[PDB]
Design a protein around this nucleic acid. Structure first.
Lengths: 78, 95, 162, 82, 83, 80, 383, 106
RNA sequence: GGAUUUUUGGAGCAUCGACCUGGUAUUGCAGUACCUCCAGGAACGGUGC
């Protein structure tokens, strides 16, 4: 309930960059970025787990108009 | 090797199978007798040292008793015959 | 559980004590015998012990079969087309069945090559003149219920039911 | 090739030169067309020698049978390995 | 080398086997010694002469040229050479 | 040259091998060795005055085979 | 049973599904001759099944004329419907859905990606009806017929080209006598040519073509099909001429022409019908015979290599790193772990955190080596 | 779902033999305390019930097998092949019209 | 891979196993050819000449 799925991100974005971008709406407790270990590139999706479900819902509701590297990043509940 | 092949060619051209070498020289039909009393008339396309023959457009005739026996014969396009069943091989048949 | 080709293919087929090919099918409780043609006439004895077959029917054409073991069952009726499917049948084991009437063994005389029969532990054998009727029905059988036929029994069978 | 070893330990029937057929589990073979048939049964057809008599085949089981290549004519598969 | 039926026939020595001749005669006896050329030397042989008349002969030796078949006993069915 | 090498180079051909004891097996020859061992699949065998039976696989020896019959669509120059 | 309502609608739906499968087979393009022949055979089998279904549905009309008086009556109705609803009010404890009411005839009349064959036509094979030398209707095998003709003629002066030239004639003079033993080989050749014509086009109506051939043999071939300008009228059976049409009509019912000869219309009628069928098969399939003759000439003119080319067409890494060791984790639903370091890495993960969040314990460093739920609850209550 | 399909088939068979649009064998059953939720058009099963009623009405045609017998579809493979070719041509024309509509939308 | 044991050729009588009737002694622990003897009938079958 406290985890939000962020998609539509480019492969050039980093996990400290995503943690700094997610810190503008609330402190993120954990950030998981699934990436292939054979190629060393991200899959364009990540999971941000906050400290509560209401803060995660407020972060997912305020990230509907975020643009990174020209691509719109979508936030959904997970 | 080459010397064994030359000796085999000399034994096929000047030995007992030289009449079989007449089957591959002018492509004449030969008469071969089998163990089941079936005479095969036809030319020999390929031969070997163990009298194994490869016949093309052969006619196999035999006598089958049903009285008096009839001369039931058949015609095969291509056939192969082993040297174990060959009894007598005639170079120039009568008819 | 019904009998199919998978139960016959997974069964153990080996050499029996009578120097014949036998396939063991004990402990199956098959209510009906069917799809027995997968053996391709490569067996001489078929065991059907501990089965719930109510009627001995549905046998395919098998010429290599020479022994039938249908003991420990509940066969109440017998099939009529048994001689046309097994022409070389010699041994028939129908012990511990539910035969009550004497008319049930009337197709059993259709097998001309039958010489061995076993109808012990059956209610049909408790009736009077059962062995005489079995001798008068099928004269080709020489051993009935582990007992050889008699000339006086054959004379009593030919004299009775005239 | 290995075509003769592909049908090993299976219920194969080999036809003899005298007309009999030996069916058994051919477990071992050799280059001289020999066969080792475990639980083998040999069946030989008998002549009727009459006008109304049918043709029968007497079959007898022998067990492990070592058949040489001089008597074997052709071998055919009959049943899978049990 | 040696064949696997030849090794099975050589390992079956000392037991009661039954050789078959080319004329239909079957001789059953204790195989004393065997050879690689299907030579069957058997003691207490029982000749049949293709008519059922089984006479008891001693120290019989059948060659491999007329040996049609060799019925081995069932005790050699678990040999490791046959697998 | 030996004739066993010409018979060994034959695969998926519907041939007819006539044996010595009045037997004739017609089928697709799948394997041939140096000892003329003919292994065929899905063949029809007819004995002397008997009904033609069908077999899924057959293995005829070299010494038991008497003659062979090949189809007409088989060149003999390339096989020798 | 609703034989007029439900069975007729089921037969109409099956016929519509067969027509849709035939339209989908005809709309798809073909790339090979054998696949096209297999598709034509499957379409012929589907057409035969649809014709059998239509013949079975067309006979279910005897009781319909008697039941239409009771079915169309407005005085009846909901009484029998309520009785059928009470009969259909049984136990519904069989919780199972059956979506194969209409999807199963749609899937039975379709093919798969691995094999383009229908479900009734799954056992059909093109190798069981045609030989390798025919090529699925590309050519015709004439080697056995030429061998039979050479065995019947008892002469080796007839090659394959001479046999193809003798077989190409339709109304010319025959090579042998009509009363000789060549008719027994000609009937077998006609029976082979009829099967080759029936195998080359399975979608065509063979019964209508056979009826048309029988009508042309009876009405035209038996009444002087070859007029002249003895040459005016010729008979195929008697092999004799005629002066005029009146003399031929008078001699058609004669005693030597009926049964008083060895080639009359009584015994030699089947041989004449086989000759007419062979002539019709040679006239209808002349292009296939020309293609077979061209293929035989190309095989004879080629060399051996060209004819052969034409005829051929680790435990150490699991033991040193501590793997393959069963470990039970009672916190995450008693899960299994195949390593101590793998379990230590999965303890500080999202799955173990989601397993520990159900009990109410926060994700901290004190519950890192906690396995049991009661020990974790005691460690959470102690702090 | 076999009982609901059988009830829908029975309703389509009882509604096809009606002499009017509202005077059927299913309108009087609604007032006879019989719960039938498939009669209302708001359900998704009503679209299948209407197709079943249309198939039952097409099964009562005079060339459907009640007073006549079809000879072209039952005794002529060439007519069936021509009908399959016409259906394939109609499907190709519908695909071309769909491609033209997609090109116009683009 | 062609020269004596295995893959390129020797190409009405004799005997045994049964089928049916009576007397007769053995009541016994083994993985086996076989398995007490006599008398009478047979219109049972295989092998070679």
């Amino acid at each position: 309930d406290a985890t939000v799925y962020v998609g539509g991100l480019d492969e050039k974005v980093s996990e400290p960059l995503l943690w700094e971008l997610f810190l503008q709406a609330g402190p993120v407790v954990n950030t998981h970025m699934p990436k292939d270990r054979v190629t060393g590139q991200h899959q364009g999706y990540g999971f941000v787990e906050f400290l509560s479900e209401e803060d995660a819902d407020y972060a997912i509701k305020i990230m509907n108009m975020i643009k990174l590297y020209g691509k719109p990043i979508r936030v959904n509940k997970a | 090797p080459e010397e064994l092949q030359k000796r085999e060619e000399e034994e096929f051209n000047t030995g007992p199978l030289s009449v079989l070498t007449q089957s591959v020289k002018n492509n004449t039909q030969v008469l071969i007798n089998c163990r089941n009393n079936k005479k095969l008339l036809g030319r020999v396309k390929a031969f070997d040292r163990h009298c194994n023959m490869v016949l093309e457009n052969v006619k196999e005739m035999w006598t089958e008793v049903p009285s008096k026996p009839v001369n039931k014969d058949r015609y095969i396009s291509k056939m192969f015959l082993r040297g174990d069943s060959v009894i007598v091989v005639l170079r120039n048949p009568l008819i | 559980v019904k009998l199919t080709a998978e139960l016959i293919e997974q069964a153990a087929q080996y050499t029996n004590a009578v120097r014949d090919r036998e396939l063991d099918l004990r402990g199956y409780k098959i209510p009906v015998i069917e799809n027995l043609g997968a053996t391709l006439d490569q067996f001489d004895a078929i065991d059907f012990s501990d089965n719930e077959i109510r009627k001995l029917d549905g046998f395919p054409l098998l010429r290599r079969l020479k022994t039938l073991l249908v003991n420990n069952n509940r066969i109440c009726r017998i099939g009529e087309g048994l001689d046309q499917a097994l022409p070389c049948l010699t041994e028939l084991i129908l012990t511990n069945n539910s035969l009550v009437e004497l008319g049930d063994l009337d197709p059993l005389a259709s097998l001309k090559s039958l010489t061995y029969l076993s109808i012990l532990r059956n209610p049909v054998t408790n009736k009077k003149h059962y062995r005489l009727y079995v001798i008068y029905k099928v004269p080709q059988v020489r051993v009935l219920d582990f007992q050889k036929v008699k000339l006086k029994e054959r004379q009593e069978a030919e004299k009775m039911f005239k | 090739s290995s075509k003769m070893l592909q049908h090993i330990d299976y219920r194969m029937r080999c036809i003899l030169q005298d007309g009999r057929i030996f069916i058994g589990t051919f477990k071992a073979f050799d280059k001289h067309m020999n066969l080792i048939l475990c639980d083998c049964d040999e069946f030989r057809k008998i002549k009727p020698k009459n006008s109304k008599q049918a043709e029968r085949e007497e079959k007898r089981v022998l067990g492990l049978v070592l058949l040489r290549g001089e008597n074997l004519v052709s071998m055919t598969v009959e049943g899978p390995p049990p | 080398s040696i064949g696997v039926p030849i090794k099975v026939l050589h390992e079956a020595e000392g037991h009661i086997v039954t050789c078959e001749t080319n004329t239909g005669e079957v001789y059953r006896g204790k195989l004393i010694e065997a050879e690689d050329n299907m030579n069957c030397q058997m003691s207490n042989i029982t000749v049949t002469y293709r008519d059922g008349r089984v006479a008891q002969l001693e120290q019989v030796y059948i060659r491999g040229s007329k040996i049609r078949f060799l019925i081995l006993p069932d005790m050699l069915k678990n040999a490791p050479m046959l697998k | 040259m030996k004739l066993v090498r010409f018979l060994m180079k034959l695969s998926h051909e519907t041939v007819t091998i006539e044996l010595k004891n009045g037997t004739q097996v017609h089928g697709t020859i799948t394997g041939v060795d140096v000892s003329m061992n003919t292994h065929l699949k899905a063949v029809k065998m007819t004995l002397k005055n008997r009904e033609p039976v069908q077999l899924e696989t057959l293995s005829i020896r070299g010494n038991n085979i008497r003659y062979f019959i090949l189809p007409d669509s088989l060149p003999l120059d390339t096989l020798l | 049973m609703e034989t007029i309502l439900e069975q007729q609608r089921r037969y109409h739906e099956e016929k519509e599904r067969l027509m849709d499968v035939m339209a989908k087979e005809m709309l798809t393009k073909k790339s090979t001759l054998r696949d096209q022949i297999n598709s034509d055979h499957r379409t012929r089998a589907m057409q035969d099944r649809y014709m059998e279904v239509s013949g079975n549905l067309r006979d279910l009309y005897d009781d319909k004329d008697g039941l239409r008086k009771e079915e169309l009556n407005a005085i009846s109705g909901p009484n029998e419907f309520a009785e059928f609803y009470n009969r259909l009010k049984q136990i519904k404890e069989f919780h199972r859905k059956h979506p194969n009411e209409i999807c199963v005839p749609m899937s039975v009349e379709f093919e798969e990606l691995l094999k383009a064959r229908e479900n009734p036509s799954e056992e059909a094979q093109n190798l069981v009806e045609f030989t390798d030398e025919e090529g699925y209707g590309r050519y015709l095998d004439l080697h056995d017929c030429y061998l039979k003709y050479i065995n019947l003629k008892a002469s080796e002066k007839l090659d394959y080209i001479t046999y193809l030239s003798i077989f190409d004639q339709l109304f010319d003079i025959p090579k042998e006598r009509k009363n000789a033993e060549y008719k027994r080989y000609l009937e077998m050749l006609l029976e082979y040519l009829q099967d080759y014509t029936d195998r080359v086009k399975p979608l065509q109506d063979q019964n209508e073509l056979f009826g048309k051939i029988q009508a042309e043999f009876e009405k035209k071939w038996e009444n002087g099909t070859f007029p002249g300008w003895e040459e005016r009228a010729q008979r195929l059976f008697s092999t004799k001429g005629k002066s005029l049409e009146s003399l031929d009509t008078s001699l058609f019912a004669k005693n030597p022409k009926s049964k008083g000869t060895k080639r009359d219309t009584e015994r030699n009628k089947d041989i004449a019908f086989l000759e007419a069928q062979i002539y019709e098969y040679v006239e209808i399939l002349g292009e296939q015979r020309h293609l077979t003759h061209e293929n035989v000439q190309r095989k004879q003119a080629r060399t051996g290599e060209e004819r052969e080319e034409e005829e051929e067409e680790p435990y150490w890494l699991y033991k040193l790193h501590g793997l393959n060791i069963n470990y039970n984790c009672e916190i995450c639903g008693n899960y299994t772990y195949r390593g101590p370091k793998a379990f230590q890495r999965h303890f500080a993960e999202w799955r173990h955190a989601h397993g520990m969040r159900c009990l109410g314990i926060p994700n901290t460093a004190h519950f890192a080596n906690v396995t049991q739920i009661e020990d974790a609850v005691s460690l959470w209550a102690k702090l | 779902s076999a009982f609901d399909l059988d009830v829908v088939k029975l309703t389509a068979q009882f509604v096809a033999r009606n002499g009017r649009q509202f005077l059927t064998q299913l309108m009087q059953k609604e007032q006879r305390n019989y719960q039938f939720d498939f009669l209302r058009p708001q359900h998704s099963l009503f679209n299948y019930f209407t197709k079943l009623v249309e198939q039952y009405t097409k099964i009562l045609i005079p060339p459907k097998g009640l007073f006549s017998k079809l000879k072209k579809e039952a005794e002529n493979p060439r007519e069936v092949l021509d009908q399959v070719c016409y259906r394939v041509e109609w499907a190709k024309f519908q695909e071309r019209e769909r491609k033209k509509e997609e090109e116009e939308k683009e």
